[PDB]
Paper text:
MjNhaP1 has 13 transmembrane helices (TMH), referred to as H1-13. Unlike PaNhaP, MjNhaP1 is not cooperative at any pH tested. MjNhaP1 is inhibited by the Myc-His-Tag at pH 8 but not at pH 6.
asymmetric unit were refined to 3.5 Å resolution. Detailed views of the MjNhaP1 x-ray structure. Glu154 in H6 interacts with Thr76 in the interface helix H3. Arg320 forms an ion bridge with Glu156. Nevertheless, changing N160 to alanine renders MjNhaP1 inactive. closely resembles the x-ray structure of MjNhaP1 rather than that of EcNhaA. inward-open and the EM structure the outward-open state. inward-open with a sodium ion in the binding site.
Author numbering:
A (entry chain B): 1 to 419
B (entry chain A): 1 to 415
The structure:
Amino acid sequence: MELMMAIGYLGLALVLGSLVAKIAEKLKIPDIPLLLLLGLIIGPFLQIIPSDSAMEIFEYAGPIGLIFILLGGAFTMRISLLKRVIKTVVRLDTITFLITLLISGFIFNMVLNLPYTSPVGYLFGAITAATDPATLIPVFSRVRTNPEVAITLEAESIFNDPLGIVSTSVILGLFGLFSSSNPLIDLITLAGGAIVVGLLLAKIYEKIIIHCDFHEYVAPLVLGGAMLLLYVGDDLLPSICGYGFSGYMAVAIMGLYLGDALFRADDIDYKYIVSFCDDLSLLARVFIFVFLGACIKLSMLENYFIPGLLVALGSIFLARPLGVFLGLIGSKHSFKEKLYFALEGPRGVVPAALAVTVGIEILKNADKIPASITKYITPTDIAGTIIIGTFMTILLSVILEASWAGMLALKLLGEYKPK
Amino acid sequence: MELMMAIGYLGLALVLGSLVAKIAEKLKIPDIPLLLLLGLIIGPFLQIIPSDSAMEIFEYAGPIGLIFILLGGAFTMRISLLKRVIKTVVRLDTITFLITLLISGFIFNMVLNLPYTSPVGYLFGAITAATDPATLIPVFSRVRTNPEVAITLEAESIFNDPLGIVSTSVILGLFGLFSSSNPLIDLITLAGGAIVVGLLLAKIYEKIIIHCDFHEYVAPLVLGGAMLLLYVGDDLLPSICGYGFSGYMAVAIMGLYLGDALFRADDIDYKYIVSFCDDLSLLARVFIFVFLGACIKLSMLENYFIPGLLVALGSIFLARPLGVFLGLIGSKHSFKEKLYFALEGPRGVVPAALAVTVGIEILKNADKIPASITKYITPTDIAGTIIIGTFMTILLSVILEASWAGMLALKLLGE
Ligand SMILES: [K+]
């Protein structure tokens, strides 16, 4: 709880992290795995930053950083250009999503000898189901590939960033909460509520920004505006209704529609936000990945190294492609194209943040409220397996992408038959 | 369950503060007073945010944002321009600062019937004596002033913020029961150390940043380095070598040397830093002023409104003038210019932040306060009077200086 300690660790993380990411850019290497390696170094390996401390810091700086990425990911692109391929986008972002998390659940259960009905694995998949846009952002921009593919991937990524949280949020209820009577109910409540309220405040902010020239004063407006969405979203509203919506998805929706409203209409206030959030997103990017590599326990790491790695392989090579094929069985896309989408989309920062947040929320709450069937496995090793599994998933997917990009892009974008 | 609610209140402060700031910017009036009024509105008046909870959040986010503000002015300041008026600046942050402090504290003690040696008054002065550049900078250029007084007042207003904090921490040591070391020792310790380590990290960062184009990645690098300096100075190092170390002044120094070096080396990485800090420094500047108005309790107002008022005027019309004149007693400037320096020294962000910090530091860690200075005045009354006093001081100084700025510049700085 030592604030100065937290500031110190965050400081070292930001310094060494920024340096590392800079080196990564200087060598065209993805920053992510290097950040993770650093996290492991200063984490268990050197014991500069202990686990519990990192957990307590992340308990505070978690949602804050998470609110940044959603914003930055919502302003990086707009939805006025999706009208061409929005169908493929939606199907790939919903059906492929659910299927992927399901199969990944099967794998996660079948690996750790957990029952195939274990909510643990399904939680893991729900976390890892979302992909990372900024990861594939340089690797498509430098290519400037067939715009369909590019914007399809961007749309899928940005749109799956919130749902993953929502999916994770719903499944967590099974592990013990104030209600969680039925997952579908809270899914509708969260999604629909976030859509409604988020779009409400989106319209409000739209009209309130257009009529003036806030300029530099836009930053405190949206950020705090997003901050309000969390209180009203997760803490406050249940106190008066029990139900509610995911504040994060509400933030994503609000910021997205707001960006597109600041782009359909043309306000100069727009250009600040993007440049603001992008710089703001970069902090949370560096901050989360390093702390993910610190929350690992050396013993737990050695215990679940091999299985998690194998789980990751199941996700990348089996889950993702299968979900792609099954989600796009009625598409106008080539087999080589579907295969492209399959071996493309990697995971990133959202599954990391969600992983650690799940770990701490379980350890802090499920210690008091452990589901019986689940309690047969120590919540300790639940959080351990989820966190390390997500870790190796991120790592493996990212490096695999780093070796995939060029070769696959050339070898799979060849045909494009004209009708 | 405190976290999400803290996010809520803080976010509300950010939104409402933003809107208010825009309103003020439109009506050609400063944002600060309206922000304080807003804080009072959602504070005691509407009771949207309980004072205890406000102070509770400020315990966390307070020190955080304080790094932003200090980082803000740091990069805006460049050294190569000061060399012509630096002799004036040095005095404006040394002797003038000390005198303003001693006199403001003197009057503060005299008002509430406290002995002229009561550390409470001098604490108030320590908090108050720091002039703010964020209210001078948008105003100075608009009124087409001479360059030198603009550069001068900017330099003073910037250099004050660290020295205000340092002095605030030093005097705080006297409010420490279990130990009361030599003031001068702590002063030279914190200051000198800040200079040293500041220059060190600023040199490292100089080479690192100059060598390659960091672009956006300066933000975590610099902020992290800043974050790093506080933990060393205000936690680790004293737990190790025993002797203290100021983090804030070190941070400010670092921003100064680094910024000036990058500006001198024409490294475009400089701007990427400035854009980042300016926004952050704007974020907390809103967050600070709002919470100050919320930390105040209704009782504090209905028991210390008028006393804090009288104290405020003393700081503005008696303290700072005498400080300026006596500081520049041998200067070769002009009487009109001296009066201009005197009548333009708004108390801004830093005095507010220090007022809240000290406020919670005293109110919470109350029982272990020395009884010598407690017998005269209740610690609750101490915190309340310092907070209110700083509040009235800031409001009055900003409003008066802003309303009189034009006429002041008109009939003074024409040599
Ligand atoms: K450079």
